[PDB]
Design a protein around this motif. Structure first.
Motif, short mmCIF file in Angstrom:
data_model
loop_
_atom_site.label_atom_id
_atom_site.label_comp_id
_atom_site.label_asym_id
_atom_site.label_seq_id
_atom_site.Cartn_x
_atom_site.Cartn_y
_atom_site.Cartn_z
N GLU B 213 5.73 4.20 -8.31
CA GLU B 213 5.55 2.75 -8.11
C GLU B 213 4.52 2.40 -7.03
O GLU B 213 4.77 2.60 -5.84
CB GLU B 213 6.89 2.05 -7.82
CG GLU B 213 8.02 2.27 -8.86
CD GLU B 213 7.65 1.82 -10.29
OE1 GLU B 213 6.53 1.29 -10.52
OE2 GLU B 213 8.51 2.02 -11.19
N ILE B 214 3.37 1.85 -7.45
CA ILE B 214 2.36 1.30 -6.52
C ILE B 214 2.73 -0.14 -6.10
O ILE B 214 2.78 -1.07 -6.92
CB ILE B 214 0.90 1.31 -7.08
CG1 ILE B 214 0.48 2.71 -7.54
CG2 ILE B 214 -0.09 0.82 -6.03
CD1 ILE B 214 -0.88 2.76 -8.23
N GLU B 215 3.00 -0.29 -4.81
CA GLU B 215 3.21 -1.60 -4.21
C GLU B 215 2.03 -1.87 -3.27
O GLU B 215 1.49 -0.94 -2.67
CB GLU B 215 4.55 -1.62 -3.45
CG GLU B 215 5.53 -0.54 -3.94
CD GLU B 215 7.02 -0.91 -3.78
OE1 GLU B 215 7.38 -2.09 -3.94
OE2 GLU B 215 7.83 0.01 -3.54
N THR B 216 1.62 -3.13 -3.15
CA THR B 216 0.76 -3.52 -2.03
C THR B 216 1.67 -3.92 -0.87
O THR B 216 2.55 -4.75 -1.04
CB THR B 216 -0.23 -4.67 -2.37
OG1 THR B 216 -0.92 -4.37 -3.59
CG2 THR B 216 -1.27 -4.83 -1.28
N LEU B 217 1.48 -3.30 0.28
CA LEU B 217 2.17 -3.68 1.49
C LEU B 217 1.59 -4.98 2.02
O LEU B 217 0.55 -5.46 1.52
CB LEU B 217 2.02 -2.57 2.54
CG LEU B 217 2.71 -1.24 2.24
CD1 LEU B 217 2.15 -0.10 3.13
CD2 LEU B 217 4.24 -1.36 2.39
N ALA B 218 2.25 -5.55 3.04
CA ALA B 218 1.82 -6.81 3.67
C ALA B 218 0.41 -6.75 4.26
O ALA B 218 -0.34 -7.73 4.17
CB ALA B 218 2.82 -7.24 4.75
N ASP B 219 0.04 -5.60 4.85
CA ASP B 219 -1.30 -5.46 5.44
C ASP B 219 -2.41 -5.26 4.40
O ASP B 219 -3.59 -5.11 4.74
CB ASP B 219 -1.35 -4.42 6.58
CG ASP B 219 -1.04 -3.00 6.11
OD1 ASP B 219 -0.76 -2.78 4.91
OD2 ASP B 219 -1.08 -2.09 6.98
N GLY B 220 -2.03 -5.32 3.12
CA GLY B 220 -2.98 -5.23 2.03
C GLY B 220 -3.26 -3.79 1.65
O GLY B 220 -4.03 -3.54 0.72
N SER B 221 -2.65 -2.85 2.39
CA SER B 221 -2.73 -1.42 2.06
C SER B 221 -1.68 -1.09 1.01
O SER B 221 -0.60 -1.66 1.01
CB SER B 221 -2.55 -0.53 3.30
OG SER B 221 -1.19 -0.30 3.60
N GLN B 222 -2.02 -0.17 0.11
CA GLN B 222 -1.12 0.20 -0.97
C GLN B 222 -0.34 1.48 -0.69
O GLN B 222 -0.70 2.26 0.19
CB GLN B 222 -1.88 0.29 -2.30
CG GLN B 222 -2.63 -1.00 -2.63
CD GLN B 222 -3.29 -0.99 -3.98
OE1 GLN B 222 -4.06 -0.08 -4.31
NE2 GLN B 222 -3.02 -2.03 -4.79
N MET B 223 0.74 1.65 -1.44
CA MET B 223 1.76 2.66 -1.21
C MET B 223 2.28 3.06 -2.59
O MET B 223 2.07 2.33 -3.56
CB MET B 223 2.89 2.03 -0.40
CG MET B 223 3.90 2.99 0.19
SD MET B 223 5.46 2.15 0.58
CE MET B 223 6.00 1.69 -1.07
N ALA B 224 2.93 4.22 -2.68
CA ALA B 224 3.60 4.61 -3.92
C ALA B 224 4.86 5.42 -3.67
O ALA B 224 4.88 6.30 -2.82
CB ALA B 224 2.66 5.37 -4.85
N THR B 225 5.93 5.08 -4.39
CA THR B 225 7.21 5.78 -4.26
C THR B 225 7.77 6.13 -5.64
O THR B 225 7.35 5.56 -6.65
CB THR B 225 8.25 4.97 -3.43
OG1 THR B 225 8.38 3.64 -3.95
CG2 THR B 225 7.83 4.90 -1.95
N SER B 226 8.68 7.10 -5.67
CA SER B 226 9.33 7.54 -6.90
C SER B 226 10.77 8.00 -6.60
O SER B 226 11.04 8.53 -5.51
CB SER B 226 8.53 8.66 -7.57
OG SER B 226 9.22 9.25 -8.67
N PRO B 227 11.69 7.80 -7.58
CA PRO B 227 13.06 8.33 -7.48
C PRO B 227 13.13 9.86 -7.64
O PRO B 227 12.18 10.49 -8.14
CB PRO B 227 13.79 7.62 -8.64
CG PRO B 227 12.71 7.31 -9.64
CD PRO B 227 11.48 7.02 -8.82
#
Ligand SMILES: Cc1cc2nc3c(=O)[nH]c(=O)nc-3n(C[C@H](O)[C@H](O)[C@H](O)COP(=O)(O)OP(=O)(O)OC[C@H]3O[C@@H](n4cnc5c(N)ncnc54)[C@H](O)[C@@H]3O)c2cc1C
Ligand SMILES: Cc1cc2nc3c(=O)[nH]c(=O)nc-3n(C[C@H](O)[C@H](O)[C@H](O)COP(=O)(O)OP(=O)(O)OC[C@H]3O[C@@H](n4cnc5c(N)ncnc54)[C@H](O)[C@@H]3O)c2cc1C
Ligand SMILES: Cc1cc2nc3c(=O)[nH]c(=O)nc-3n(C[C@H](O)[C@H](O)[C@H](O)COP(=O)(O)OP(=O)(O)OC[C@H]3O[C@@H](n4cnc5c(N)ncnc54)[C@H](O)[C@@H]3O)c2cc1C
Ligand SMILES: Cc1cc2nc3c(=O)[nH]c(=O)nc-3n(C[C@H](O)[C@H](O)[C@H](O)COP(=O)(O)OP(=O)(O)OC[C@H]3O[C@@H](n4cnc5c(N)ncnc54)[C@H](O)[C@@H]3O)c2cc1C
Lengths: 227, 227, 227, 227
Positions: B213-227
């Motif tokens: 899962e690609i989310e944009t964080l508040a600072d406009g930087s992106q992140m990715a997580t998985s179960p």
């Protein structure tokens, strides 16, 4: 039931350059990839040396200068059938491959036995015997978790039991496998597997694997050596 | 001169089945390869389970049952530019990749500095200074083997110096890289590199990398997580 | 001839600190090494946290925070005898170990067969048969290079044939082996090997391996799990 | 502040034979382990060859016959300080080591610059400048998560910034590192690191590393080669 070795090349590298790189080459796929990775190191996409301008010539130079790490970007996957469990035990000793093996009757006869009809019959009678003992044990067990009864009865199965294996590695890993196993020193069955893998890879990437020499030995078994 | 991150997918696995295998699937290339390797383990080329008959469904099951070793047969090569030497130092810590790096002025500005014009100017003045010092040293040296004078003067070059790198690994290695680096914990620059590599690989192999899962964080930087 | 599993810990890490480092700990060897490597990362040789000041407490924290890479500095070598060729085939699939195997009659009886005298006799008669067939073939061959006749006749030897193996790996590799193989899922023989290796390593490094729980299952076979 | 290279051998293999093996040797630890692993392959614990009966002679034979895999059972850990970040980037390219690096002002001066007082002053003024720029940026940032401001300001730090690193590998990995880096071809700083690691390992295991020749070159820098 007797089966013979089968090696099939089922995967290879497909290469596409970034559009914004002023570079083109006289070949496609794996060998173009290897050249790209080399030029990426030194920023030689414009080809300043007339000697090593072509792909084949470029890759041949990589070899002599010993930048074999460039070979690691290219990949090949074989599907191997008609290989004994004992030869598969040798194959998996090469730790930079990735394997998917058939979860453990078809059998592989050693060629020295296969070449003598009378030994072959003797061998196959020993194979039937192993199989009779396997069933007679598995039925005794299941009588009184049932994956446990089969895994116990398997203990009786011979080295010759056929395995099937998907094997992936980069060109450097392939070259090393072939270098160790295709030499005259090596066990006969694993040597044959290596020669056959080489033959497939000489078709797939003629310059990367071109330096390997396939000779037929006197016993009709093949071998491969390289400087 | 300031450069930005560029990730380009330059290589991938091409798959072709052996003709003598009664099996076909609804997809081509890497993801078909992965399915093939799975079915090769259990001899399920005839698809006995209606649930996991399709490629996407088949690969999704591989995941839950934790047979991620099947992912090792598929390969991807990135060409990465606009990455600092410090981020490249982090990238090469992942030991199942193969790398070809630009042999060590273009510079990479950290985004937190890039977002403030006044900090950016301050940063770039520090970069010019490093470069002035490099030249002033290299000229002092060469005055009085000349590969040795450049390699000595380089000592003065900043972390921000741009690198360029060819990076190859199998899908399992990619998933692990992305899992470690694309998480919020991680250093900002290497996180961005990981997200970008993921984005390319989600296009190339949607089911293998779909669970990220690609989310944009508040600072406009992106992140990715998985179960 | 029937043999039983034997696992012997024949090598381990010996640690000595550099004299010029102001640090001491409440333990010797491998676990002190692991702590040293951790403190080397963050320069915490002076122990600023009262919670994680002791070795055992320090190593326990490494675990929760998932810095398991620190475990890679510590090494252990097992000498394993009384292990079948089929279990050795499974063992060598773990690619971060280093192996030296007995170059291929003593046999290993699966415990489910060993526990029934009547099955055991049936099993051992199948083993004698394999051995009779091996000799009858090897003598037929040598009659009419002689390393080639033995390697051909071996094809007839069962999975149960005893192997002996020297196996080295770092603590991270050990933990991974044990995690995969000591779980209830796993093949019985390789599970037993893993439990036994764990037992030795729980003595050698109680905190590194302390989180693993050895239970005896109902069938009297042992298992190990960890959070 | 200028620091010099420091290499310290902080870990090594401790060997103890299983009591039930009729074998003894004229040496302790790593080199006895290597011999044990060799004899374990061929069951030569009784020493049938008078030529290769002693440890030193045994290990020397392993070398010529190219059974270098036996070297993988023995391990060594170095703690390295006074090594630049650029040399550490080269060191971590060797993928069979395990590393724990100091999480990123002490600096490493290239010896060619260190040998000229006037260049050295010029170098150190460039180092002070980098450090002034680092602080001036970090303070500008923190003014307006704070691990993010330091990791951004670091971008300005030079290649010469000192690193400290724990490095573990087996004797085969060590031999390969030294073979590649201690040769005259190699970058000066990484060559020095390799020679120094070799020197420590020649003390620790004289026969394993005995074949390496340390020469002082004309420039007073040292080198090592082997047949
Ligand atoms: C004459 C001879 C006799 C032998 N006899 C025996 C025997 O009786 N029993 C036995 O078990 N083995 C024996 N071996 C060794 C065995 O054949 C090999 O270990 C096996 O084939 C794996 O190949 P590889 O060691 O080249 O490494 P692979 O796993 O194929 O890796 C390829 C290369 O990567 C490197 N590499 C991979 N992993 C590591 C690592 N952990 N540490 C350092 N480097 C690594 C090495 O450079 C290696 O050459 C013998 C070898 C020779 C030459
Ligand atoms: C919270 C945290 C803090 C950290 N801090 C630091 C630090 O300050 N300094 C520092 O140097 N490192 C630190 N590390 C570790 C470092 O980030 C990793 O070692 C590095 O990114 C390489 O990734 P990897 O260890 O997963 O292995 P990779 O090389 O990416 O390999 C992937 C997987 O293959 C396996 N593997 C590969 N090689 C081996 C081997 N030789 N032995 C056993 N298994 C192997 C492991 O399962 C590994 O997970 C930290 C890690 C964490 C989680
Ligand atoms: C339910 C299940 C069923 C399976 N069925 C089969 C089967 O039928 N046939 C079969 O052949 N296998 C099967 N496997 C996989 C097989 O058991 C493992 O591949 C084998 O035990 C080696 O262990 P490992 O894959 O964890 O890697 P190891 O070689 O033990 O390495 C340890 C870790 O290092 C990393 N690593 C090492 N080398 C690489 C690499 N080249 N690329 C990326 N990462 C690497 C991985 O993180 C790995 O977890 C199955 C696995 C599971 C979970
Ligand atoms: C003349 C020359 C110039 C070079 N120039 C550059 C350059 O400009 N940029 C650059 O990035 N690199 C360059 N390289 C390569 C780079 O120096 C090496 O890749 C790096 O030092 C790692 O060493 P290694 O490749 O021997 O492998 P290591 O990681 O040290 O491993 C040791 C051995 O294990 C085996 N091995 C480990 N992992 C794998 C794998 N995944 N696949 C197959 N085998 C494996 C190989 O046998 C290898 O020799 C150059 C090499 C040479 C000889």
């Amino acid at each position: 039931e007797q089966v013979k070795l089968s090696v099939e090349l089922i995967a290879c590298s497909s290469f596409t350059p970034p559009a914004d790189v002023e570079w083109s080459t006289d070949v496609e796929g794996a060998e173009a990839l290897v050249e790209f990775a080399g030029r990426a190191c030194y920023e030689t996409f414009d080809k300043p040396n007339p000697r090593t301008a072509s792909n084949a010539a470029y890759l041949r130079h990589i070899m002599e200068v010993g930048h074999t790490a460039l070979l690691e970007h290219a990949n090949a996957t074989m599907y191997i059938r008609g290989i004994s469990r004992s030869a598969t035990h040798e194959l998996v000793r090469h730790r930079h491959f990735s394997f998917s093996q058939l979860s453990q009757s078809e059998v592989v006869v050693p060629t020295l036995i296969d070449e003598d009809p009378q030994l072959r019959e003797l061998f196959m009678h020993a194979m039937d015997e192993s199989r009779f003992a396997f069933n007679e044990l598995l039925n005794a067990l299941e009588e009184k978790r049932k994956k446990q009864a089969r895994q116990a009865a398997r203990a009786v199965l011979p080295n010759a039991t056929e395995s099937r294996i998907v094997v992936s590695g980069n060109f450097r890993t392939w070259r090393h496998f072939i270098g160790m196993r295709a030499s005259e020193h090596a066990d006969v069955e694993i040597r044959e597997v290596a020669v056959e893998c080489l033959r497939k890879l000489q078709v797939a990437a003629p310059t990367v694997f071109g330096d390997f020499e396939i000779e037929t030995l006197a016993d009709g078994s093949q071998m491969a050596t390289s400087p």
